[PDB]
Symmetry: D2
Amino acid sequence: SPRRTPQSIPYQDLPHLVNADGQYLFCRYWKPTGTPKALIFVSHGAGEHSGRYEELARMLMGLDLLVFAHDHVGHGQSEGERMVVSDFHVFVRDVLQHVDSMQKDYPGLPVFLLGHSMGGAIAILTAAERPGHFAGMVLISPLVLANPESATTFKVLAAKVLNLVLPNLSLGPIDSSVLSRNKTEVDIYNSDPLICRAGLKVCFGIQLLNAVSRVERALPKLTVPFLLLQGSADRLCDSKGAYLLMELAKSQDKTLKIYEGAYHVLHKELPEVTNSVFHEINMWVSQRTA
Amino acid sequence: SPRRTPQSIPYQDLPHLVNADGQYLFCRYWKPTGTPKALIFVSHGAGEHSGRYEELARMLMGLDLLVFAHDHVGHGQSEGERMVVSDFHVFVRDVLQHVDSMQKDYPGLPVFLLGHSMGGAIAILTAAERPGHFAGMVLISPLVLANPESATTFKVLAAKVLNLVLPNLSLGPIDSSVLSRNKTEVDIYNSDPLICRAGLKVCFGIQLLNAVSRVERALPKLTVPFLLLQGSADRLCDSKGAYLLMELAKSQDKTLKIYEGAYHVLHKELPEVTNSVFHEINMWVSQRTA
Amino acid sequence: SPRRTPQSIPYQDLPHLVNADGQYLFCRYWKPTGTPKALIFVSHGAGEHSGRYEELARMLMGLDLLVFAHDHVGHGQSEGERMVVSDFHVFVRDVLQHVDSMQKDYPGLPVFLLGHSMGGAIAILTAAERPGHFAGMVLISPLVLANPESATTFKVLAAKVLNLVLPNLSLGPIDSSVLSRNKTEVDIYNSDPLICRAGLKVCFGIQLLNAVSRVERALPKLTVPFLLLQGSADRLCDSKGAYLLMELAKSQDKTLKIYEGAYHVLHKELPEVTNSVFHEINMWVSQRTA
Amino acid sequence: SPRRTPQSIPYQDLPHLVNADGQYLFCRYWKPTGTPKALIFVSHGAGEHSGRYEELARMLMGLDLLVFAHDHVGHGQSEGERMVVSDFHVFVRDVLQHVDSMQKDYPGLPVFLLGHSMGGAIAILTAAERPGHFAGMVLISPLVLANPESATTFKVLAAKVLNLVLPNLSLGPIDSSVLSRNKTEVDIYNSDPLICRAGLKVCFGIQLLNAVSRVERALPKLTVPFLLLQGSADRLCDSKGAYLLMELAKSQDKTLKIYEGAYHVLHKELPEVTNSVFHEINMWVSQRTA
Ligand SMILES: *C(=O)N1CCC(CNS(=O)(=O)c2ccc(Cl)cc2)CC1
Ligand SMILES: *C(=O)N1CCC(CNS(=O)(=O)c2ccc(Cl)cc2)CC1
Ligand SMILES: *C(=O)N1CCC(CNS(=O)(=O)c2ccc(Cl)cc2)CC1
Ligand SMILES: *C(=O)N1CCC(CNS(=O)(=O)c2ccc(Cl)cc2)CC1
């Protein structure tokens, strides 16, 4: 029985890679028509998947960059129990494998990282493990701070307790309306069968917290250049973390753009925001490439 | 500001009633063309709503029965925080008010109860509080026993603990595929904006457990006639409870029909099951009416 | 088999009374040689017992007051599981029974209350239930406030959790050196076989907390006259509660005496403190009696 | 300020050693008058101390064995917070240091281990780490199995929970009457100011559980000869563990003696038991020495 995606598609019929844990990961690529000037890995957030970055990737591809990605373990078309991971570092390790693989085929090319939410945390931790290895990082409402509301020192304590007693315990529920102010995208979001909307599991929320702790420790050694995109009304990733990221990161090349009133999914928000986001990412990456 | 449904429709524009807690409840009616031979209240399950019984109600209406219902508090178009109730008895109290109201307009008419899942528990508790008052009860995979898997003496203990620390804590996630084997209805189920699919809250799961405890105590005094419809593969309401209901209830008029392999939502299952269900309910109620 | 004390002495051989719960309570009396001018019930603290007030009682007896007492349920020579009570109010109820019994034999006589620690809480709650019934109250480092250290909003939450899971769970350990600065009495305290030094049980700590809550609510209606004796270095009953008691109680006749550096057991502290305590209690009660 | 024992005696005035954690441990020695035929380390149980083995040690000394010991960290006259240890292995590590020190001064001499309760677990783990290094082991009601009553899979789970929330949380209370049937020794036990009777702390109970887990894993590789002394009525260390120890240990030289009705502290039990214990230990060790 050939290995198949959680949606029953055989892996031999799709682009993929096998991780250190022997798990198949669904891969995605956007190769420019000619010799690429640089490489860029896209890191998606929790529950979502790599296919959600189709248009963003097509814009980057139009700049002559070889865009690539894969669905994190337990996500999209990749193997593994939905939204669960032995340890958060697995996400980083897998990213490095994919990056290391792509760099071998395209030697001497600069490598950028693009991450959103949990994807942002992964990106930060990826560069933090390889100082001076990446050319730049594009962060869209990255996970850097614990929800001052959804995760207080008390709720974290309780979650840790649940982890010992009811680890497999699934939580919830999160209103998809806090993702974007664009109703179309909210519907689109609820219609995606590759997305996961089954509420954060206990053991996974712990990992998410591990991620934030790790990111905070990493910041004093983060030197990679970055573009930080954040919305003021982000109820998932508080803008407080964005300002803290700008302050605590040691990077010499760091930019912050705030979108007043915007929500979480900046790249899938109101046309006026999405347009600026796409544009800003374009200008930023363009200047850092040649 | 006139009171409006959770979906923003003013209550003065829909049939409704105001409960003892001063909360508006959305009402639904199916009045036969001529003098009704009997009355029948429909009690929906958790998360769902009264509109889901359109066809079942139309069949009953065709038998000359005045069908009526309302969305339980915190459900459908009724007021109240989604899937929460101060105490389970509130559901019963409200049913009695609606029944008491309808009986006043149609004196001397017999009154039946139709309940599914949590709705079944409510029905049982309603008749148990008014012995010899109802003519009959139709139960579709009623809530009578605690999930031997989802709620063991340990998980119940943990839930009770969570109730003290994280009461407002929402849970999850429940796969909608365990509801029916009919894919159309599963999609239909996920498309209903009146239905609630945000995972069982902690404080509410407690109430659900209160319900089961109360039902067990009530059974030794339950004398109302009933038709019990249950599926063998029900992962929400184990068939064990059905057999126990047949054995522990004191009723002199009690019937049990098992649907081999069928799931939870019997009235929305495979055509062959739904057809028999509708038919059996028809024959059963018909014989008890004149 | 005639009922015997927890130490195996038959109750028919000692002064006693039987409470509403059918439990035997060991009684103690100090009757003046002639007609008593007033009655005074002594309420001991947790773990300890009525025999610990021998000398204090003998001084009061020398003032022509009929002193009386009994070991609270689950204490000293009284029946009941060590340091456990269905509800704190039981302590109050039993006090009233004993007071009501003694008043019948000595009609028209004024009635005072003397309480220490938990005994103080009981005294306050006793008078609060019978406004204008008692002539006065003598409070020695009374239980009125929750240990700002041993019981924070978090520890209380945890205790409540333990009450559901591990109610019978016994705690600990409390250093007897925090009771008094007088080493002799500390040794004396550890040598008493009637005293309980087995650490506070979970279910009992809850009751203790109930007591504090009840006392706080009662204070706005407490009108009984009182003498408040408190030590600055009391690590069991923080002096903060004493000042709060002086402020929150409505009594028109309220006095506070602070013993600088003194510990918990004021009546069993350094000679200089104990001497003043005995003296102050003497003067205070004397003026209120005739 | 020279380091002093918890009882204020300077360490320079007593025999001692400094552990790997820089903590002072109170040492005790019983050196025969002439060249010793072997060495024997005594491992005391929880709360107690090395001085409790005075007579046992004097008997062993009379057999020409160099007896030695030290109070485990957080015990007796040794430094460290009462009844707490970073990890159970610390106890083993310290034993090896003391053994390694003594062996250097007395090269080529065989080395025996004597342990009671928690002391027995330490002894087993000490030999398990150094297979074929010790000549023999004398075990008195050793800690090998979790209290089927005081520690069920549920209570262990709860304890682990407490470890995360209330680690410093002290427990209780343990009736000293379950130690021995000899009332004199029970009094003696309660009179010892070097003994600890402040109830088992949460973080420490965890370690105790770690110990049992470790012992069970070690048994399949335990080859050291041993004498196992156990009482049938031991409520602290169930005799079940003794039989399991006899069965699960791989040792070729293993003996078991059961004392019918006897309690925990076999060496401090009824004269008839203590006499046999001392005698049996004498015969057993004598045969294994020359
Ligand atoms: C982006 O992909 N995300 C998903 C994860 C959320 C919440 N992360 S967190 O605030 O660190 C958190 C972790 C664990 C719990 Cl239980 C609650 C909150 C941020 C946006
Ligand atoms: C019908 O409407 N339902 C909804 C409720 C389920 C589960 N009820 S239960 O098994 O009693 C339960 C109560 C509380 C918890 Cl946390 C888990 C399970 C039955 C079908
Ligand atoms: C006087 O008799 N006492 C005994 C009781 C103590 C502690 N009472 S408390 O601070 O309300 C408390 C209750 C429950 C817990 Cl678990 C801890 C502390 C006061 C003096
Ligand atoms: C000998 O020294 N002892 C002291 C320790 C006891 C109990 N040990 S246990 O049964 O493993 C246990 C560990 C932790 C908890 Cl919370 C309860 C019981 C055996 C004799």
